[PDB]
Symmetry: D2
Amino acid sequence: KDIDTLISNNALWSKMLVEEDPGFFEKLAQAQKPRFLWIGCSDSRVPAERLTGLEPGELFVHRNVANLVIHTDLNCLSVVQYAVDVLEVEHIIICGHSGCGGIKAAVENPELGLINNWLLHIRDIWLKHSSLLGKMPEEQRLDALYELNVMEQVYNLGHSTIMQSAWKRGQNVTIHGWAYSINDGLLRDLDVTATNRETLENGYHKGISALSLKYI
Amino acid sequence: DIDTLISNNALWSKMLVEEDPGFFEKLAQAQKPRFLWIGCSDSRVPAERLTGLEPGELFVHRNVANLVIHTDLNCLSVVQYAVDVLEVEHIIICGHSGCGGIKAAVENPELGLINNWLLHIRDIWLKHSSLLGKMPEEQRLDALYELNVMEQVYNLGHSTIMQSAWKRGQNVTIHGWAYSINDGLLRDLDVTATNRETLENGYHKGISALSLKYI
Amino acid sequence: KDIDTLISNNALWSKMLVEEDPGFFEKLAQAQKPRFLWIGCSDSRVPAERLTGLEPGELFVHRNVANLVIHTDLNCLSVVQYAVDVLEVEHIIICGHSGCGGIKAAVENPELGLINNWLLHIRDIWLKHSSLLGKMPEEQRLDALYELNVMEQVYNLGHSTIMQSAWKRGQNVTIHGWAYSINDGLLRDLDVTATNRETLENGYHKGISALSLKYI
Amino acid sequence: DIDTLISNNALWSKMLVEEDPGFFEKLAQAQKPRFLWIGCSDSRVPAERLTGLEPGELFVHRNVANLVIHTDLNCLSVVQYAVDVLEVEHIIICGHSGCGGIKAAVENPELGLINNWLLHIRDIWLKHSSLLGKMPEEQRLDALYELNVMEQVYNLGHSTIMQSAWKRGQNVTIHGWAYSINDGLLRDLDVTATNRETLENGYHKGISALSLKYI
Ligand SMILES: [Zn+2]
Ligand SMILES: [Zn+2]
Ligand SMILES: [Zn+2]
Ligand SMILES: [Zn+2]
C-alpha cells in the first residue's frame, strides 16, 4: 500500500458515502459533543470505534506509547482538561492491550533511544508491584503488567488537578480502566471505576486485589 | 451508556471469533505499521475509515489540534519510537475543518489549562497575519487549520529524530494533509518532505499554494 | 577543585558564620516569603544574588538552557504558578546574558543531541525577527538575538494562563525583561515591563522598536 | 523595590570594573563548568556560597523540590547539554529542609497547577510508607526530603543520558546531598554513583543508612 492508494481509497469512500447518504456529513456537524474520552495506546491494535461500536463524534481520543497519564505530561493533561472542563465528557476510559511493544520494551530494556525515558514510568509500575509480580509465574508477569499499568494510569488521572476539581464540584465524570487481549479483542473491566475520590481509592485497591487473586 | 459499549464489544468479539477466528491469530502475528498518523483528538472521521488502512498498518498519536511542539516529549516519544524502532516509511500530520482547538485559539475564551497548549496555534496565527489579511475574514479560520498543519510538518522535519533519520539516508516521508468535515475528502497541502531540501522548498510551496487558493 | 574540597569549604563557611552570627540561620526561617521570581539561564555566569544585591530568601529561582518560558513547559510553568499564586511574588524577572551557549548553538546548529529540540524555540525567534536581524550587521545578530529572546519569553510569560488570571483578578505582579553583557555585568532594562495585559502588549512593541532603533 | 536592584547592580559593576577590570575579561574567557547543580527553586542558600565554587564552575538547574522527572524535557535538556556538551564531571542533586514543595506534597492544599508536579513527591512518599511508619511522625517530613533526593538521583542515573554516558566510559559522578536550613551544612546521603553497579548499590545503601539514622 502506497500514499497514492490512500488518496484514491478516500476519494472512493467519500463518493460512495455522499451518493448513498448525503446527509452523513451534514449530521456529524449537528451531532452533540463527544460524551467519551478514550486514552489508548499508539499501537491502536483494534480501533476504539470498532472495539466499542461507538460512532465517530461520540469519542474524543488521546493516544500515546503505552497509554500513560503521566502526572506532568501537559499533552495528555491538556486533552483531559479540554475533555472534562470544555466538552464535559461523562466518561474517561483508559484502555491498555496485550502484546504492547512499549510495555515489553520497558521490561526488556533494549537501548531504543529517546523513548526509554517515557518507558521509565512503566518501569516504576513494575517496581511498585514487584512483590505481587514475584508471587505469579514469570510468563504471566508481562500480562499482569499491562493491566497494572492501566489501573495506575487511572489512579494518576483521578489524582490530577483536573479530576480532583471536577469531582469536588460535583461534576458527573466516571473514569474507567479497561484492557483487552489481542487474542480475542474482548474488553475486560479492571474494576477500578471511579465517580469521586472515595471510589477512586476504593476502586484502585479493589482492582489491584482482584488482579492479585486472578494471577496468584 | 457504558453497559452498551461492553454489550457491543461482547457481540463484536464473539461474532469475529465464530465467523473468522484467524482474524485474531493474524492480529497476534506481528507485522509492523508502515504509517504514523498524527491527528486531532476530535477524531471527526477515524484515520482507518478516511484512508482504508488496516489497523496494523497505522501507529497513531492524537492531541488537541494535531500539534508537533518542539519540546513535547509525548509526541516526540511517539515519533522517535515510530521512526527509529518501527521504522515507519510515512508520517502523516492531518488537520480538519471546524476544529475546536483552532477556533478556541482565535476566539480566546478563558478555558483553563488548555489555553497554554493553544498558544502554539496563536504563534502560527501571528506568523501568517499578513497572508490572512489578504483574504476575506470568513475564510481565515479555514486557512488557519491548513497553515497549522504545514507548520507542524515543518516542526516535525526540524526535530532531532527526523534530522538524524534523513542524514543517515533512512526512507521517511512526511506529509501534511487536511480534510473538511463537509466531505471527508483528504487534501494534500503539498508540503511533502523526504529530506532537508524538500522540507524547506515544500514548506514555501505549500504556503504559496494556500496563498494562491484563498487570495 | 574536587568534591572533598566542597564538603570542607561548606563546613568552614558554616562554622565561621555560626561563631560570628549564630542568628543568621535563625533569621532566614523567620524572613518573609521571596518577593521576586528570577528566571535565568543555567549558564549562571554571574549569580542573581551578586548581580542584584538581593539576599537569599528574597529570590525564588528557575534556571533552564537559554532562560526560556515555553508555552507548554510544565517545569517552568509550575515554578511560575507556585511563585505567583502561592508565594505571591510581586516581581518576575527574566534575565538573559551575552555569550550564551544555548543561543549560539541555536544559530550555529551543531548536532548536539537532545538539547537541539529545546533550542528550536530560539530558532523560532530568529525566524520571527529575520527582517529586523537582516537590517543590522551580521556580527551584531547574536547579541540582538539574546535580547529578543528575553523579550519574547516575557511575552510568553504574560500570555500564560497564570499571568492572565493573576492580572485579570487585579493581583500586583510586574514582569521584567533584563539582560547583561558578560563584559560588564551591567543589567539593562529591555523596557518590556508589564503590570497588566495593556502594558504587556505596549511594552513588547516598545522593547522591539527600541532594540531595532539601537542596532539599525 | 526594582530601582534598588538596578542601583545595587550599577554600583557593583562600576566597583568591579574600577577595582579589577580583569574580572570581566576572565568572565569573557570561556572555561567550561565541571559541575551541574540541580537544586530547589527555594534556593535558601545559593549553591556558590554553600560550596565555595566560583560561578564559572557551575551549571545550574532549579525547579520546585529539585526533581528529575523521567519525562521532564526541561531538566533532561539541562542534563543532556551538561553531560554530552559541557562534559561536566559531577552532577549534584541537593535538597533542603523546610521545602515548601515537600510540605505541600504531604499537606495537599489545593494550590492549583503545581499540585500535578508535586504528585511525583507523593509517589515517593507512598514508596517509603513502611520506612516512614517506623519513625516518629514529627521526623517524617525531614526523612521525606532526603528520600526525595535519593529517588531523584536514582531517576537521573536511569535516564538515557546517564546510561549512555556510563556505558561509553565517560567520567560522570552523580551525588545526592542535603542541607538543613538550621545550619547550612551539606550532608552526603551516600547514594554516589559512577556506573550501574554503584547506582543500584548506592541507592539501597542510602535508604538503609537513612532508615538506621531515623529508626
Ligand atoms: Zn501498546
Ligand atoms: Zn480538532
Ligand atoms: Zn546562557
Ligand atoms: Zn525547596
